[PDB]
Amino acid sequence: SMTDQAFVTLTTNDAYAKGALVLGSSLKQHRTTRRLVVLATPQVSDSMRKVLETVFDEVIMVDVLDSGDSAHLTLMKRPELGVTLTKLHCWSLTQYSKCVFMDADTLVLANIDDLFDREELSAAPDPGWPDCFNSGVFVYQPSVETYNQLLHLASEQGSFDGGDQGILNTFFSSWATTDIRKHLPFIYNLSSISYLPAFKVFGASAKVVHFLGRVKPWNYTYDPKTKSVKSPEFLILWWNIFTTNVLPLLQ
Amino acid sequence: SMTDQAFVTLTTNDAYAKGALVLGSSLKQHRTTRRLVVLATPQVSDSMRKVLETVFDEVIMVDVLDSGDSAHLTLMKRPELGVTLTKLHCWSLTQYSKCVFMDADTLVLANIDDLFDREELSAAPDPGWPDCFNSGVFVYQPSVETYNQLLHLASEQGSFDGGDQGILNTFFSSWATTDIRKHLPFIYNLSSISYLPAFKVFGASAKVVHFLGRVKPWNYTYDPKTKSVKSPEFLILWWNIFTTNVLPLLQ
Ligand SMILES: [Cl-]
To answer: From the record, what ranges are coiled-coil (chains A, B)?
Structure first.
């Protein structure tokens, strides 16, 4: 239908692939007309890539350890940024005129195809330092130039936070002060860590939930008997999509 | 110099007056050309009001328990909102064409007179729910109409958070989506609770620190010997301004 535009995610191992499988499924459940793309590394097992193919339209291999990879010389300068340099390959996807990147620890709650109305770089405020955008969800335009500039920046300065958010905020440094249309509503990237009164009032309209913190949805022990985890509706939802929609897909 | 414009704060008791005394002093140290105003309630002791007069140009009494007060009928509808209705009297100060309200648990680190370049309602994002502004610091235009509309809102709906921030966000509900110039940089209202890598990179430019959480700067036990508290440079600064600049003022 809309071959020109895609949601793009990233899996660097089989654990995160379970995240991507749930994200992908949630986009399908809310009936996106866009393509679904996952960037995968060789650390993702062949059998998991086959599961990824049942949900994603494209499973695109990216290996920054390969000397043919465009980011490989940058990795040799910044060996701590392998995951970040892999994610930044989202800008190499020049077969698409516009994409929404979503981290594999997000979950979609309603159709968010109206994000394609936005322009690069559109993103929600990060809680905690709200003059930085959160890099879990963003609208961007693939470009080899932009990609190479991003690699240059990573080369010169690394990332002020060790991951992709620092570098993307440093690159797209006008976000906080320029054009409010580039501020996605917080409900398009609602932090699981995120002000209870604000949530009582605004939470029902959540469109995307972003599972932050060290413990990811797929590393909870889920108990099918009780439909519950050991340690809430979003985490329960995650597991619902996984058990109900993902598990029966490779058969 | 600039009789038309003011910084405005609020003290509902003697504890908070110590906050206001420090805020006021910090505005003076960074050489504001504007007036300094404190709204005080009768719970503030006469002797503390006299201390407040050594720092503030105007100490303006507000008593919502008085039946002559404009908010008194609203208080009878919402008896839990006395402090909030007192703060909203900042909009009654029609002798001023433009003001910056600052909670008494803020501290100024550099001249912020360039806030008078902004228009109502300008405010920084709240961390945690960043599509709401934080109500600790905001640029507004005094108006009896605006004030009465605010009282009406408080009457009809109360405050979604129990304090002033809910109601001000509900009233000024276009803040998140309209005119980025109404987004104050986070450095004009930097949460003490506020992302360590972001602070390493951005904290040096802090212009206002906002002491959040249940334990206020003035309720720490300060030890003059060690220049330290029991439980960091901002809290130490607070105490420095208090001991050095405030204590010698009533003599
Ligand atoms: Cl704008």
So the answer is: none
